[PDB]
């Protein structure tokens, strides 16, 4: 998604604050849509990183954030 | 484009952050130093030479134009290396542009030397055995540890197109 305030903030704010926001936003979608995938998502965020999702979540009008689960864990 | 592909997989930062290994990073996956250094005087000193002007800030910051310039140089360096590598190069030369992008995406993530470790996958790509290549990519620790990205990238290797990136 594109969010004018979160786009630029996510590019510039301290990493710890940004990762807290990214991780909360992902985990809220997981809990709503595929709650059983929580442990898998947590595992991937720890092994693969959190910061890289800032662009698709907040800077990209062509990315629908409902698809962030598959973005982290793969299709289906 | 590789810019659009790697902006998606690496994110976009105008201020330093530290990757999963503790290494200072900025822009589109631009590694500043392959060392777990947090000292901002030292990070900014190295980044100033890489960008070409004095970086300031705790953490250091760049402009969007500088992030693009770092990316273009990083991409070119990686493409130089992948084509001249005695194992990966022959494979890159033998597949279509989409599968080239998949290999370049992996090399951007793990280095051309990391890609060279995928013997079974590379051999299968040279044979045109895309299902075997896909299965070998998905059988890897790389897939276990960055599963979303490995999924999208191996889907290219299987299908020969970029629809796993929405193209
Ligand atoms: Cl949503």
Numbering used by the authors:
A (entry chain C): 23 to 98
B (entry chain A): 175 to 341
Tell me, in the authors' exact words, what the paper reports.
One of the T4 early gene products produced immediately following the genome injection is gp61.3, also known as Spackle. Spackle, along with another T4 gene product Imm, confers the infected host E. coli with resistance against secondary phage infections—a phenomenon known as “superinfection exclusion”. Our results show that T4 Spackle forms a stoichiometric complex with the lysozyme domain of gp5 and potently inhibits its enzymatic activity, whereas Spackle does not appreciably inhibit the cytoplasmic T4 lysozyme (endolysin, gpe) responsible for cell lysis at the final step of the phage lytic cycle. Crystal structure of the Spackle–gp5 complex shows that the binding of Spackle induces an allosteric conformational change in the gp5 lysozyme active site and partially blocks its oligosaccharide-binding cleft.
To that end, we co-crystallized Spackle and gp5 lysozyme and determined the crystal structure of the complex by molecular replacement phasing. Two crystal forms were obtained, in monoclinic and orthorhombic lattice systems, for which the structures were refined to 1.78 and 1.92 Å resolution, respectively. The monoclinic crystal contained two Spackle–gp5 lysozyme complexes in the asymmetric unit, whereas the orthorhombic crystal contained one complex in the asymmetric unit. In addition, we observed several 4-(2-hydroxyethyl)-1-piperazineethanesulfonic acid (HEPES) molecules bound on the lysozyme surface, including one occupying the oligosaccharide-binding cleft (C-site)20 and another in the peptide-binding groove in the monoclinic crystal structure. The protein structures of the three crystallographically independent complexes were essentially identical to each other, with pairwise backbone room mean square deviations within 0.5 Å. Spackle engages a highly positively charged horseshoe-shaped surface around the deep substrate-binding cleft, spanning both the N and C-terminal lobes of lysozyme. For instance, the main chains of Trp192 and Leu186 from gp5 lysozyme make bidentate hydrogen bonds with the side chain carboxamide moieties of Gln37 and Asn76 from Spackle, respectively; the main-chain carbonyl groups of Ser32, Met33, Thr34, and Ala35 from Spackle at the C-terminus of α1 helix accept a cluster of hydrogen bonds from gp5 lysozyme. Although Spackle binds over and partially blocks a distal site (E/F-site)21 in the substrate-binding cleft of lysozyme, it does not block the enzyme active site or interact directly with the catalytic residues (Glu184 and Asp193). Superposition of Spackle and gp5 lysozyme structures in the complex with their respective unbound state structures shows conformational changes for both proteins upon binding. The conformational change displaces the lysozyme catalytic residues (Glu184 and Asp193), both of which are in the N-terminal lobe, with respect to the oligosaccharide-binding sites.
